[PDB]
Symmetry: none
Subunit: 121 residues, 2 copies
Amino acid sequence: MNKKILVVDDEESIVTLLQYNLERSGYDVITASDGEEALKKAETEKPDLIVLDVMLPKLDGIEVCKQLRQQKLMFPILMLTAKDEEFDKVLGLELGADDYMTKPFSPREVNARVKAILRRS
Amino acid sequence: MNKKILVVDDEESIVTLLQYNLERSGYDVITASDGEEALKKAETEKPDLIVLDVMLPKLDGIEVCKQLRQQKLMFPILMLTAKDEEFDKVLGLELGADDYMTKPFSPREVNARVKAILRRS
Ligand SMILES: [Mn+2]
Ligand SMILES: [Mn+2]
Ligand code: NA
Ligand code: NA
Ligand code: NA
Ligand code: NA
């Protein structure tokens, strides 16, 4: 069976892009548009990987990771950052992030990053 | 004057190997051990060719290429990949990579690849 990816971004266009391309690549995809929804879906649907926007409404990406860590939950996490919004990757490691991708990104870039992370496990 | 090669790998032994052999072959060599250092050296020292490890700390090889491309910078780039970590060369072309070499590699292989790339320019 297909691996399941939870895609989380508040920009609808980014979610649509990610879902289309990852489904084409043979993954099952579920989505969230805010951090509260994301945390609930992670806890319940147990995705194999989470693609998570850093700047998110309700609970931001840092907070989502922090709450997962507090629950002792470990997910492969690809963090998405905006142009010229540098992220502290040492903090990211504290939070359980596994990799980072900046926006904009191409279909092949995201496919490559997700594949590499899924292989590392 | 000698052509200048920027060699970037987080394994010290690989950097030492590359520097020794390329200097012997008549190149000037500068080095970096993470992607942040690599990007800074590329932007500042303007090497004639970059030998770049795909799996790099701070900024990985994809990210280094992506940032160079965003700055409109064009460098001849030889990407280094690990054993059984296949890389998407169509993505590589998007990123400006010119050639690929797997690890482990011999002194003559790297000398040949660098020579061919420098000739293509
Ligand atoms: Mn956002
Ligand atoms: Mn490496
Ligand atoms: Na929803
Ligand atoms: Na993780
Ligand atoms: Na250094
Ligand atoms: Na290039």
